[PDB]
């Protein structure tokens, strides 16, 4: 459950948030495979409520109606085609499994669903599963509202409705079995693992009982006895009774402290400074590295109201964001997930974005295709952060340095820092309001290296900055605080 099941030497996943299956299939073939990406987190592939007020928000996909593989991203045939095509080029698929709940209890009954299945939230009737009132936690929840009211009570957090979402009775073998039926359908299709949505809202032992029903991965693509990768979405920023360590027997956990603190450090909030990152990892109160799924932002919190609130860095903060993502991808802590987003008309009123509900780019509710521009960026309002040179090249950096120790740390006591990954890579950051210019020990073999942030190694030359490492392992680095990207990264495969 802890191993990602990526190909050896592929070390990240990318969240292709709200992408259609056909576009992901193409992306696997044309980009993710050649550029060394390990896999893709897909949006929930099961049927959800079609919500028209507001118009088709992203969050409708976190309100299940059934386990039919029938969504705005595509149908079952399209989903299977994507998984096959991606696996055939060695890029894995991880499913966002929405298994704590069905839809909101106040959603109107009918067939306003992505596959047209009937459902009746008021009567607890989801006949396409099927679930009935016997399958929800109405009777078990002890709060006066039936919803979660107080996160200091670990029981209600699990047994009551998260903001009114009908809460499945996950102690029941029937319910566990319907969820496992869905998940095993997906495993047998070829998926490599799962994000378990809303894991804080499930008992560790109920998750374990579901996981005990899961198959090993499809043996046409994976070695015998391969377990699905499991990463549990548990928001644990401290100060609540529920700790993500309670979930370690099931799989990895999302470490939301990671992006929250990296954001405060890079924004220099409350006197924080990059020099403090020397002991990044468990020293900052994080989970063990071998249980962490790390990320700068996720699909929730990039809208500003998630775990981390306002500190979270996103594509909107492109310059600082690239730096944060770069630090993450260079540092050995955790298994890394890169976000890939769409643009929306973000409109702040009184410090909050009133358009944070807006769904993916669409024509009358039909999600737009991802178009690829000649410069390799995307059109149709897809941001495609994973195609930004500075991010894609750091995904590659992480592959190149895989397994190498954190070493050769330098800092100036402020925001100019550097470190290496054994003898395979070195990275240098300047987040101070003045220039960096210093000779540093890099740990690398002598030679000329292309900076993969400002450029690329192409046809035996560098298109950007070149760094010259001497016989002693030392190299001079110069980074103005006015640089487009105030960080430089070099590695064994960027050597000329
Ligand atoms: Ca629950
Ligand atoms: Cl997440």
From Swiss-Prot:
Cofactor note: Binds 1 Ca(2+) ion per subunit.
Site (Transition state stabilizer) location in chain: 300
One GO term describing the cellular component: extracellular exosome
GO molecular function terms noted in the UniProt entry: alpha-amylase activity; calcium ion binding; chloride ion binding
Binding site for Ca(2+): 100, 158, 167, 201
Cofactors required: Ca(2+); chloride
UniProt cross-references to Pfam families, sorted A to Z: Alpha-amylase (PF00128), Alpha-amylase_C (PF02806)
Location of this chain's protein in the cell: Secreted, Extracellular space
Location, primary (coarse class): secreted
Glycosylation sites per record: 461
Reactions listed under catalytic activity: Endohydrolysis of (1->4)-alpha-D-glucosidic linkages in polysaccharides containing three or more (1->4)-alpha-linked D-glucose units
SUPFAM superfamilies, alphabetized: (Trans)glycosidases, Glycosyl hydrolase domain
EC nos: 3.2.1.1
Keyword Disulfide bond appears in the UniProt entry: yes
Tissue: Detected in pancreas (at protein level).
InterPro entries: A-amylase/branching_C, A-amylase_C, Alpha_amylase, Glyco_hydro_13_cat_dom, Glyco_hydro_b, Glycoside_hydrolase_SF
Catalytic residues (UniProt): 197 (nucleophile), 233 (proton donor)
Family listed: Belongs to the glycosyl hydrolase 13 family.
Subunit relationships: Monomer. Binds to the sea anemone inhibitor helianthamide.
Annotated protein name in UniProt: Pancreatic alpha-amylase
Organism of provenance: Homo sapiens (Human)
Gene: AMY2A
């Amino acid at each position: 459950q802890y191993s990602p099941n990526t190909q050896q030497g592929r070390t990240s996943i990318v969240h292709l948030f709200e992408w259609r299956w056909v576009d992901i299939a193409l992306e696997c073939e044309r980009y993710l495979a050649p550029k060394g990406f390990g896999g893709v987190q897909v949006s929930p592939p099961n049927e959800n409520v079609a919500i028209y007020n507001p118009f088709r928000p992203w969050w409708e996909r976190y309100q299940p109606v059934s386990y039919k593989l029938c969504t705005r991203s595509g149908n079952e045939d399209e989903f299977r085609n994507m998984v096959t095509r991606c696996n055939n080029v060695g890029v894995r698929i991880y499913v966002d499994a929405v298994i704590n709940h069905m839809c909101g209890n106040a959603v109107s009954a009918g067939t306003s669903s992505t596959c047209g299945s009937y459902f009746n939230p008021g009567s607890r009737d989801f006949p396409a599963v099927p679930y009935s009132g016997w399958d929800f936690n109405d009777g078990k929840c002890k709060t006066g509202s039936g919803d979660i009211e107080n996160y200091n009570d670990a029981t209600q957090v699990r047994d009551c409705r998260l903001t009114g979402l009908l809460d499945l009775a996950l102690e029941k073998d029937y319910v566990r079995s319907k969820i496992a039926e869905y998940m095993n359908h997906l495993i047998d299709i070829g998926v490599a693992g799962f994000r378990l949505d809303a894991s804080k809202h499930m008992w560790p032992g109920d998750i374990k009982a579901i996981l005990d029903k899961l198959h090993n991965l499809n043996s046409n693509w994976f070695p015998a006895g391969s377990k699905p990768f499991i990463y549990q979405e548990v928001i644990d920023l401290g100060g609540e009774p529920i700790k993500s360590s309670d979930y370690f027997g099931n799989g990895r956990v999302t470490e939301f402290k990671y992006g929250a603190k990296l954001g405060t450090v890079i924004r220099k909030w409350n006197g924080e400074k990059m020099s403090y990152l020397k002991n990044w990892g468990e020293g900052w109160g994080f989970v063990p590295s071998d249980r962490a799924l790390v990320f700068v932002d996720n699909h929730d919190n990039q809208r500003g109201h998630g775990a981390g609130g306002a500190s979270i860095l996103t594509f909107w903060d492109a310059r600082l964001y690239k730096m944060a993502v770069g630090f993450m991808l260079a540092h050995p802590y955790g298994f890394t997930r890169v976000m890939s987003s769409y643009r929306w008309p973000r409109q702040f009123q009184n410090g909050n974005d009133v358009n944070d509900w807006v769904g993916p780019p669409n024509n009358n509710g039909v999600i737009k295709e991802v178009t690829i521009n000649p410069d390799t960026t995307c059109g149709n309002d897809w941001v495609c952060e994973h195609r930004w040179r500075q991010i894609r090249n750091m995904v590659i950096f992480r592959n190149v340095v895989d397994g190498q120790p954190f070493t050769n740390w330098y800092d100036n006591g402020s925001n100019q820092v550097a470190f290496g990954r054994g003898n395979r890579g070195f990275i240098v950051f300047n987040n101070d309001d003045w220039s960096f210019s210093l000779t540093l020990q890099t740990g690398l073999p002598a030679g000329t290296y292309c900076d993969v942030i400002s450029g690329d190694k192409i046809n035996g030359n560098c298109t950007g900055i070149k760094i010259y490492v001497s016989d002693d392992g030392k190299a001079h680095f110069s980074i103005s605080n006015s640089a487009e990207d105030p960080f430089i990264a070099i590695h064994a495969e960027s050597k000329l």
